[PDB]
């Protein structure tokens, strides 16, 4: 039972935000504790996630994922809030940003289609908040770069924000609208509940990322 | 149109790499030249781009895009060389990297399905090059943060690399294997060659982005 030995390949399912948050420190720990195992990832959208996890082709899934209900074990890692993001020298955006200012400024939206993060557009729209979306993008990769050279502002998850704040010189403010908490859970299928390798790996996840 | 007064939505097609490189400077320009139009973007490997572009649902596409052939126009904007990338304080990694060292080190791979960045997997593999892949990922979002935290190296488009260097503490090296250059093209359908709106934006792409 000494990890350094293993030469296994784990398949991990996560969103783009996930990958960017989870992966850098997972790779650190793997380098000193199990430097011979191989990780590959993939978007939950891409497949029958359910079917893939059942037939063992996907060892673990990170994220929000409501569909994963019966036959899946679940473990809570952290809750995070939607947060308002803009560059650090933004000439007008205040912290805490007010609900009025949040209407007047120009935004970049992220569609985040079929994720938890796509709830956002609709909840705002329904609170009566029409944002001037000068830019709409399908995913998050660009927000750092865009916000950095522009006066736009984005609605973003707090753990994404904290990744982007030093690299791109941005700041955060609590979100002036009422948005739900997004809860990042870890999922495995019942069959791999007592698989030594699986347990080990998820134990690692909970150690690095569990806020308890 | 009156670019300033215009109110039009442009639908644009690009890879996550494209978004990252094109979007910031583009927004910075629309701010001054056309502050009331809305850009929306999407990926090429979704919907039916050929049919959508012909339809009018998609106004322009950027990237390699071989399938777009008749009825579609193009214009080369630039060719980027692939390059080698790793964190500034890396122990082994040296610039210029030896082909031998490139194999001794561990990599993170981007699969990047149906982009010109898919040929890499095989190009290198068919050139008789073996590389130890500790991590494999569907796209680029996490590439910068991963290299920052670890000792992995990556095979990446030079332009991605310059956008990454300073935020994530990274340096590059001419790639020590024979890889080709990769052409990024501005595309559009024949129905919209003479469209005043489409023309104007295309011309703005040519202005901001063309190596010539």
């Amino acid at each position: 039972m000494d990890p350094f030995a293993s030469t296994r390949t784990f398949n991990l399912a996560m969103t783009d935000i996930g990958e960017m948050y989870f992966m850098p420190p997972l790779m650190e720990a793997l380098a000193q504790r199990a430097p011979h195992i191989q990780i590959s990832t993939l978007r939950p959208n891409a497949g029958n996630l359910k079917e893939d996890m059942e037939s063992g082709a996907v060892d673990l899934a990170l994220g929000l994922l409501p569909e994963l209900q019966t036959g899946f074990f679940q473990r809570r890692l952290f809750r995070h809030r939607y947060v308002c993001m803009f560059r650090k020298d933004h000439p007008s955006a205040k912290s805490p940003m007010s609900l009025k200012q949040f209407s007047e400024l120009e935004h970049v939206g992220v569609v985040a289609l079929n994720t938890g993060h796509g709830e956002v557009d609709g909840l705002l729209e329904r609170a009566g908040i029409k944002r001037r979306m000068r830019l709409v993008v399908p995913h998050f990769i660009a927000i750092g770069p865009i916000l950095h050279s522009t006066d736009l502002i984005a609605t973003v998850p707090q753990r994404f924000a904290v990744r982007c704040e030093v690299p791109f010189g941005l700041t955060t403010s609590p979100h002036p609208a009422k948005l739900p908490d997004i809860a990042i859970n870890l999922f495995w299928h019942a069959k791999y509940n007592r698989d030594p390798g699986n347990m080990w790996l998820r134990q690692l996840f909970v150690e690095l990322f569990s806020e308890a």
Side-chain angles (χ1 to χ4, degrees), chain A residues 15 33 65 73 118 134 141 185:
Chain A
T15 61
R33 291 129 93 153
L65 305 180
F73 289 90
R134 168 180 283 151
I141 194 169
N185 270 34

Side-chain angles (χ1 to χ4, degrees), chain A residues 126-129 131-146:
Chain A
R126 267 188 280 152
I129 300 155
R131 293 173 303 166
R132 301 147 167 178
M133 239 86 67
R134 168 180 283 151
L135 184 45
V136 183
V137 304
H139 306 306
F140 292 83
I141 194 169
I143 305 297
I146 298 169

